GROMACS .gro file of N, CA and C in nm:
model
  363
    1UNK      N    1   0.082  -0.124   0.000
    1UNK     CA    2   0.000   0.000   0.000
    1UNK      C    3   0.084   0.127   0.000
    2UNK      N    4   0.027   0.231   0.012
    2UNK     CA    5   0.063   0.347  -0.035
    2UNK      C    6   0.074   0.378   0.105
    3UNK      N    7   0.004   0.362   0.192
    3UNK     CA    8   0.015   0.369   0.367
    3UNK      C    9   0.207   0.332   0.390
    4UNK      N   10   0.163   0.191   0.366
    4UNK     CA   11   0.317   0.131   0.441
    4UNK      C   12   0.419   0.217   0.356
    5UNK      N   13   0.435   0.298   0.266
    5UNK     CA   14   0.513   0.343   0.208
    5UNK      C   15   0.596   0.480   0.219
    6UNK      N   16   0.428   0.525   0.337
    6UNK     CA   17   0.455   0.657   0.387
    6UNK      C   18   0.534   0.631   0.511
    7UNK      N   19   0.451   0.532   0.620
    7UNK     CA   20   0.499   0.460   0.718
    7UNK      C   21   0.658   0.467   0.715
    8UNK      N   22   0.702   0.346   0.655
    8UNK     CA   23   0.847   0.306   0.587
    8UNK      C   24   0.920   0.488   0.569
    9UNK      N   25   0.912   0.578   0.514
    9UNK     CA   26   0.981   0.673   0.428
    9UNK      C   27   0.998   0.746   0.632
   10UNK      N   28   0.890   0.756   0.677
   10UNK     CA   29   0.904   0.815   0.841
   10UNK      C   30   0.973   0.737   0.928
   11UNK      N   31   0.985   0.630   0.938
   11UNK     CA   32   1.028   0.501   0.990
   11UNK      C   33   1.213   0.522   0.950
   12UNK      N   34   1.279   0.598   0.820
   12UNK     CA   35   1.365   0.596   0.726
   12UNK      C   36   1.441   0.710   0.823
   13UNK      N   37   1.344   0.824   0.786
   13UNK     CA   38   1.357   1.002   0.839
   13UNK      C   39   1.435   0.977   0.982
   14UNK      N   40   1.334   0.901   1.083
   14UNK     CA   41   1.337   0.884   1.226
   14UNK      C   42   1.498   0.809   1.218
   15UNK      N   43   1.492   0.687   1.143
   15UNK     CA   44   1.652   0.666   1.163
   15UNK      C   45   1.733   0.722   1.125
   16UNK      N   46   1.719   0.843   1.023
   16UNK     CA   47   1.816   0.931   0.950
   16UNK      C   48   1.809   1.007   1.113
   17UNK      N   49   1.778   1.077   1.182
   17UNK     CA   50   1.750   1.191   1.283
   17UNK      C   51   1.799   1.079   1.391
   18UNK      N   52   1.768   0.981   1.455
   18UNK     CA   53   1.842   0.913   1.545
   18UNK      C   54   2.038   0.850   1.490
   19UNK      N   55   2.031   0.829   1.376
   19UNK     CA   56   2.195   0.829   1.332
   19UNK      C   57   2.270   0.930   1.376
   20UNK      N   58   2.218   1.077   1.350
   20UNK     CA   59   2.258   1.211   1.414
   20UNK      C   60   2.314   1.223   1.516
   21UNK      N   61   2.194   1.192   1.607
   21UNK     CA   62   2.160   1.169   1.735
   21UNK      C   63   2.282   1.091   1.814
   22UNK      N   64   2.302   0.931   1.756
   22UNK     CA   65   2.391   0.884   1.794
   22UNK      C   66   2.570   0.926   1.790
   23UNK      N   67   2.558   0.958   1.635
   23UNK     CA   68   2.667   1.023   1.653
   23UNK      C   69   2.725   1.162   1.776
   24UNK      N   70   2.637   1.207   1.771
   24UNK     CA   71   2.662   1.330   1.881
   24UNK      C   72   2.658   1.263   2.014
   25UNK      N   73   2.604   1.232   2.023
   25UNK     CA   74   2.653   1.098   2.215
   25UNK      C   75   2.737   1.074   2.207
   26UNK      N   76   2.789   0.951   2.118
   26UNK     CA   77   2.935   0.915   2.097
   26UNK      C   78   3.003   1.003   2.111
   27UNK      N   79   2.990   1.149   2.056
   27UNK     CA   80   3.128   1.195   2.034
   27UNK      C   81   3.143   1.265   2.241
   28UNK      N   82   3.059   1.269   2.280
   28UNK     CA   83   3.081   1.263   2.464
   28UNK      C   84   3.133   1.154   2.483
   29UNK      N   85   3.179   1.038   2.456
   29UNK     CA   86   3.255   0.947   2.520
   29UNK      C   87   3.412   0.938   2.426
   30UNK      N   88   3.465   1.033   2.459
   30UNK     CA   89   3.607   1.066   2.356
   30UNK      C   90   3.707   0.911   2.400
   31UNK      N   91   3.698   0.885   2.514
   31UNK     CA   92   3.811   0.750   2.583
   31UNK      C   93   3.681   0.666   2.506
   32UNK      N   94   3.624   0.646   2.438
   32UNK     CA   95   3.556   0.527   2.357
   32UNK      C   96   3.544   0.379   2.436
   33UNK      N   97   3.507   0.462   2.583
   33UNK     CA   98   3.486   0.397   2.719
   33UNK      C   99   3.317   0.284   2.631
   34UNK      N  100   3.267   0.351   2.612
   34UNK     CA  101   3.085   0.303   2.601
   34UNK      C  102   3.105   0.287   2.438
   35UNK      N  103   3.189   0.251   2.360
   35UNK     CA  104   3.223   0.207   2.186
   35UNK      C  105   3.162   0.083   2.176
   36UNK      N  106   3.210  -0.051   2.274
   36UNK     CA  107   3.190  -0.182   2.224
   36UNK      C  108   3.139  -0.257   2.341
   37UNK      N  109   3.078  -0.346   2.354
   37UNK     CA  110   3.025  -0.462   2.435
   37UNK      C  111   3.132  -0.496   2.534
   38UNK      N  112   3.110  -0.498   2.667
   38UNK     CA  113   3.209  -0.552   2.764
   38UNK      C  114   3.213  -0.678   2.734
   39UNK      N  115   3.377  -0.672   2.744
   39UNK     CA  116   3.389  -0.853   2.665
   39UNK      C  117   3.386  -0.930   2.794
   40UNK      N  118   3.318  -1.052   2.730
   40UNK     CA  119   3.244  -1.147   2.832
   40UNK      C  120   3.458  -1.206   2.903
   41UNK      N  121   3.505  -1.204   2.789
   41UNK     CA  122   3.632  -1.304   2.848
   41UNK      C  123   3.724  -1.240   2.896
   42UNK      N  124   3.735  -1.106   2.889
   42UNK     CA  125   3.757  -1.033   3.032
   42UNK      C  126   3.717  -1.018   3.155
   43UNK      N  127   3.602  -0.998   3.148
   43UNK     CA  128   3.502  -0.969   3.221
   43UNK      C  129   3.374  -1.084   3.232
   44UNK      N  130   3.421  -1.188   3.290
   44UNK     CA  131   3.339  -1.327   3.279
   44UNK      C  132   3.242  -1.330   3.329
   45UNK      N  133   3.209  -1.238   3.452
   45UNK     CA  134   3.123  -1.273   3.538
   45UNK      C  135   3.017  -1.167   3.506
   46UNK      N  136   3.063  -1.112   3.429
   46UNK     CA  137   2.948  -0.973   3.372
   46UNK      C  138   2.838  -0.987   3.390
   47UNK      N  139   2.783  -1.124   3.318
   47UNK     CA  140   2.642  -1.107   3.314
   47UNK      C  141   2.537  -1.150   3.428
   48UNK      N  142   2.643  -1.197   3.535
   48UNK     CA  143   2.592  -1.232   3.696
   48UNK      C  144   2.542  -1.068   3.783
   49UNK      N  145   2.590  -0.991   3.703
   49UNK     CA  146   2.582  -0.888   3.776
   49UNK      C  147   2.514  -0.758   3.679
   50UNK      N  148   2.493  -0.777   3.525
   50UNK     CA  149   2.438  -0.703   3.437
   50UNK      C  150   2.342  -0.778   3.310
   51UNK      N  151   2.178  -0.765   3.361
   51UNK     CA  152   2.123  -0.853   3.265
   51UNK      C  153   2.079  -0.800   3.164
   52UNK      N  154   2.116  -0.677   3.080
   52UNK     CA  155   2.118  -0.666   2.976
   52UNK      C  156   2.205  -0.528   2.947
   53UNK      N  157   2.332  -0.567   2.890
   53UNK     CA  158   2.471  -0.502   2.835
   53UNK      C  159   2.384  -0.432   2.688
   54UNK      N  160   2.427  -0.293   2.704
   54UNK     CA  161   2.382  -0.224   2.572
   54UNK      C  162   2.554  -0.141   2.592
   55UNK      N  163   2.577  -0.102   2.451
   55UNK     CA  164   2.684  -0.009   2.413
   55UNK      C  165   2.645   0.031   2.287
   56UNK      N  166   2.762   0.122   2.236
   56UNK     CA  167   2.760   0.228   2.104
   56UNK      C  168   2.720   0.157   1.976
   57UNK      N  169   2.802   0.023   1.995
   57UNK     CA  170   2.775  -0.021   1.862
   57UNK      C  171   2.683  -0.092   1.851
   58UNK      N  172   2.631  -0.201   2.004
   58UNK     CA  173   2.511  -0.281   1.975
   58UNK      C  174   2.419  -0.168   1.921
   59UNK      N  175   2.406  -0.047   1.915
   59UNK     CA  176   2.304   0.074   1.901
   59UNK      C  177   2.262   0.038   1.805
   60UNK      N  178   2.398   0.097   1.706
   60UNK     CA  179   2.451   0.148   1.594
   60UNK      C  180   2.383  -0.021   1.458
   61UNK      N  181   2.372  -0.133   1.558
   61UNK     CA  182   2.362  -0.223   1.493
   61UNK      C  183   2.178  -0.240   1.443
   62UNK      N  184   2.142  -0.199   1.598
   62UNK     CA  185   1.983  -0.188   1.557
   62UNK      C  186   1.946  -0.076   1.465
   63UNK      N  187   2.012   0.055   1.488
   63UNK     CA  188   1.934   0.166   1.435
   63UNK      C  189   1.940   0.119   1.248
   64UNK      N  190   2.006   0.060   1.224
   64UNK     CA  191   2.083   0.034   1.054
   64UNK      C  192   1.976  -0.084   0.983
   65UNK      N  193   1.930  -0.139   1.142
   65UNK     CA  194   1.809  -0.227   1.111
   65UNK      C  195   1.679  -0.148   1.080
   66UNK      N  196   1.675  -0.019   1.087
   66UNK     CA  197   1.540   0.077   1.138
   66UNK      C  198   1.479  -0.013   1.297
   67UNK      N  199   1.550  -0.081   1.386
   67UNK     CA  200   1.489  -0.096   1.476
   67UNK      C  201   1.452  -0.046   1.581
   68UNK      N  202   1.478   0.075   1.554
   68UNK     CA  203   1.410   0.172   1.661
   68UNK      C  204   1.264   0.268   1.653
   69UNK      N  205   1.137   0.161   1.675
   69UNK     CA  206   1.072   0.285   1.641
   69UNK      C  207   1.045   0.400   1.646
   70UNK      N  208   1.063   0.423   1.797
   70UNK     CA  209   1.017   0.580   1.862
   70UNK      C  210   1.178   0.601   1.902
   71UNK      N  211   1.218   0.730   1.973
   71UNK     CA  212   1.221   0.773   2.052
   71UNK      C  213   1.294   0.712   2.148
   72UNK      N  214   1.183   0.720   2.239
   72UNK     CA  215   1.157   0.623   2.356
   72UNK      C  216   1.222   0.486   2.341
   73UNK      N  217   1.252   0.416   2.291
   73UNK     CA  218   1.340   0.287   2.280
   73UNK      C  219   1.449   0.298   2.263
   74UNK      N  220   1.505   0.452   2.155
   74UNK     CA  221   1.656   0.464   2.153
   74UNK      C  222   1.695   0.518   2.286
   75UNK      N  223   1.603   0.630   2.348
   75UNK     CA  224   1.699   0.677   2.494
   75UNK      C  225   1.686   0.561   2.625
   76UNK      N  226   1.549   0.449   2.554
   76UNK     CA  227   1.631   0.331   2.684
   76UNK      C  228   1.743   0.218   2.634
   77UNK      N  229   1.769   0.224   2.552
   77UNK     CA  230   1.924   0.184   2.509
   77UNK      C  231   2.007   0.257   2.571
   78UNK      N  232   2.033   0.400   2.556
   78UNK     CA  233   2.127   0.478   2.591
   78UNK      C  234   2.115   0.487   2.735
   79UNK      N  235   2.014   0.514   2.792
   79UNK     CA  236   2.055   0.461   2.944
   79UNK      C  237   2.056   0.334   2.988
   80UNK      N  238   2.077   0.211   2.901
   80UNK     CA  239   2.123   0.135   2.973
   80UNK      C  240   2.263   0.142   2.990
   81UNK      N  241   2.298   0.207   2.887
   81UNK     CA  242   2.477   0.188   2.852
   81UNK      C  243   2.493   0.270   3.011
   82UNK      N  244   2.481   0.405   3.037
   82UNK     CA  245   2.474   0.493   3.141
   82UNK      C  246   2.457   0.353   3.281
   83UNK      N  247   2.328   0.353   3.287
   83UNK     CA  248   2.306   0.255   3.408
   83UNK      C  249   2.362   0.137   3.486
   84UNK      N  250   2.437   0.075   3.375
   84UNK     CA  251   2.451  -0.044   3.383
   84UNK      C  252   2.649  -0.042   3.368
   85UNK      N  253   2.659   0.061   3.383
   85UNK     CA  254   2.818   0.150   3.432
   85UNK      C  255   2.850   0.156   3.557
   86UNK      N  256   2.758   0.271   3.577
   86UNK     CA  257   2.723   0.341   3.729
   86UNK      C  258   2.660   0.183   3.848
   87UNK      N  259   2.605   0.090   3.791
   87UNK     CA  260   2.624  -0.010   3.875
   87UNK      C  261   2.736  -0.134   3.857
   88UNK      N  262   2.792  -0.166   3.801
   88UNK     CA  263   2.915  -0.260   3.777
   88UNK      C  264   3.072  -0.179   3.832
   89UNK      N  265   3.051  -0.095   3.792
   89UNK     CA  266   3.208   0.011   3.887
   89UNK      C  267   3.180   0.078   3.981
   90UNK      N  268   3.260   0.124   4.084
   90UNK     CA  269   3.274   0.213   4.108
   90UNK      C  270   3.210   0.331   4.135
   91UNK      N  271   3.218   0.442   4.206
   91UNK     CA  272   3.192   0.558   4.242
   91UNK      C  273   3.324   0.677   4.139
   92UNK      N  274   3.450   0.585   4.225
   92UNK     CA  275   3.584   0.639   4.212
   92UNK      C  276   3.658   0.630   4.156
   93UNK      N  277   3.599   0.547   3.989
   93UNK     CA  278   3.659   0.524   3.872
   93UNK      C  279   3.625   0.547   3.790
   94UNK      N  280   3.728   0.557   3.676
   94UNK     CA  281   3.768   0.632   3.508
   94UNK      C  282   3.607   0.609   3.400
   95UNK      N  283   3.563   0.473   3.433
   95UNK     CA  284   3.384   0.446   3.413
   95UNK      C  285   3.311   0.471   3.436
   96UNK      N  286   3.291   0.477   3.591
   96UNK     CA  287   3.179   0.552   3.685
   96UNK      C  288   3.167   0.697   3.615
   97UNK      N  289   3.292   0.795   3.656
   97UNK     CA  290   3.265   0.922   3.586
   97UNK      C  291   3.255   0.941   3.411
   98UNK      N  292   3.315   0.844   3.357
   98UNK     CA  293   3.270   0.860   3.221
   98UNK      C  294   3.127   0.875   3.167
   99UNK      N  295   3.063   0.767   3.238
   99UNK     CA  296   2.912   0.786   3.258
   99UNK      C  297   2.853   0.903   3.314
  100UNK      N  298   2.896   0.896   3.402
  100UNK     CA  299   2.801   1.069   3.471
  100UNK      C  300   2.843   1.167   3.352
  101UNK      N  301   2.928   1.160   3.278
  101UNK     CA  302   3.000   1.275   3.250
  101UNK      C  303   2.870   1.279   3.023
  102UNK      N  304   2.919   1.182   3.046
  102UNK     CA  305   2.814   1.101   2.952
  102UNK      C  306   2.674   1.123   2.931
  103UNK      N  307   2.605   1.098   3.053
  103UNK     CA  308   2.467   1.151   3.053
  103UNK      C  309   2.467   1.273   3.089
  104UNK      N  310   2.510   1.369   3.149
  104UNK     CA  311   2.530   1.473   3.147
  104UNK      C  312   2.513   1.588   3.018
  105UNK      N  313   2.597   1.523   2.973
  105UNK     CA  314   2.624   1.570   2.793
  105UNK      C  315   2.504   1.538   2.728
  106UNK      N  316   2.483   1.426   2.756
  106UNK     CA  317   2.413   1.332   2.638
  106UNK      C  318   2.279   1.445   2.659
  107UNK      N  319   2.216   1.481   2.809
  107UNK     CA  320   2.120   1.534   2.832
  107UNK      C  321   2.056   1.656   2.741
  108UNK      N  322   2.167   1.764   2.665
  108UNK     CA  323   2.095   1.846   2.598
  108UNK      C  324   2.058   1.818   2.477
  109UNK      N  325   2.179   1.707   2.427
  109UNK     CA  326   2.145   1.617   2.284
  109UNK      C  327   2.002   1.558   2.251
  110UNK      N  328   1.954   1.515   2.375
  110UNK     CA  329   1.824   1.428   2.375
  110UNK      C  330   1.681   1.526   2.412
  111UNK      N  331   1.759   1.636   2.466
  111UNK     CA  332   1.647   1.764   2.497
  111UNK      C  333   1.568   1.775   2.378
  112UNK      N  334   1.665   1.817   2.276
  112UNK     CA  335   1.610   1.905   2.128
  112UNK      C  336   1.577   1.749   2.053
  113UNK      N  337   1.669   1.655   2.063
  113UNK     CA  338   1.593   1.566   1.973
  113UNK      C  339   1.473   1.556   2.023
  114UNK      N  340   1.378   1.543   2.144
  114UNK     CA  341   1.296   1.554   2.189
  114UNK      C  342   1.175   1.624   2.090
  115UNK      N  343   1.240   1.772   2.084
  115UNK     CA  344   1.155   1.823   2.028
  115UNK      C  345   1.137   1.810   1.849
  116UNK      N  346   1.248   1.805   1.807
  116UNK     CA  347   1.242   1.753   1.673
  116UNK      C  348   1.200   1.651   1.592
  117UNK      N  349   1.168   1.562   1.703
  117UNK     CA  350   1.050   1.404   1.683
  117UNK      C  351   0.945   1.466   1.651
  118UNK      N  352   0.922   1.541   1.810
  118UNK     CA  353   0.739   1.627   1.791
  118UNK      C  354   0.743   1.731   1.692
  119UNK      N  355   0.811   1.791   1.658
  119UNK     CA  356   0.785   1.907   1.541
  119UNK      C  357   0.753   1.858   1.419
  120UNK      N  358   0.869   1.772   1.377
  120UNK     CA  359   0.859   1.688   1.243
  120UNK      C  360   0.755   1.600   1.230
  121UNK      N  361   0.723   1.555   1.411
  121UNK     CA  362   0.610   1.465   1.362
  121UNK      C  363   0.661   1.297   1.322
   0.00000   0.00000   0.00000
């Protein structure tokens, strides 16, 4: 149909405007601390203590899928990466504050995308 086509082309837009999006987060994590998946064989016991690991690129892997519909699903990705930091380290380490420092940033990025969902529609 001519529906799913409009659907699809907004569905397209939204991942063109969340690609943006991502890129500008990333570029707040310059030590490319939150880049890749904590590796399990470093870090073995990871998943005893974190039940669902999100980072930059698992993102980067859905958004390319268009699997993000709204919004709302890409910024709970992005705070898991945030969340799931701030509980596995530290207070008083190079991670812990990368994160704070992270959402911090990330916060005005996600302000205006906010509004540029609702404007555009």
């Amino acid at each position: 149909s001519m529906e799913q086509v409009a659907m699809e082309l907004r569905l397209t837009e939204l991942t063109r405007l969340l690609r943006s999006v991502l890129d500008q987060l990333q570029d707040k994590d310059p030590a490319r601390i939150f880049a890749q998946p904590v590796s399990l064989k470093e870090v073995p016991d990871y998943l005893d203590h974190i039940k669902h690991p999100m980072d930059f690129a698992t993102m980067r892997k859905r958004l390319e899928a268009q699997g993000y519909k709204n919004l709302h699903e890409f910024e709970e990705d992005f705070d898991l990466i945030i969340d799931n930091c701030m509980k596995y380290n530290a207070r008083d380490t190079v991670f812990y504050r990368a994160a704070v420092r992270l959402r911090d940033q990330g916060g005005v990025v996600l302000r205006q995308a906010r509004r540029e969902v609702d404007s555009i529609g």
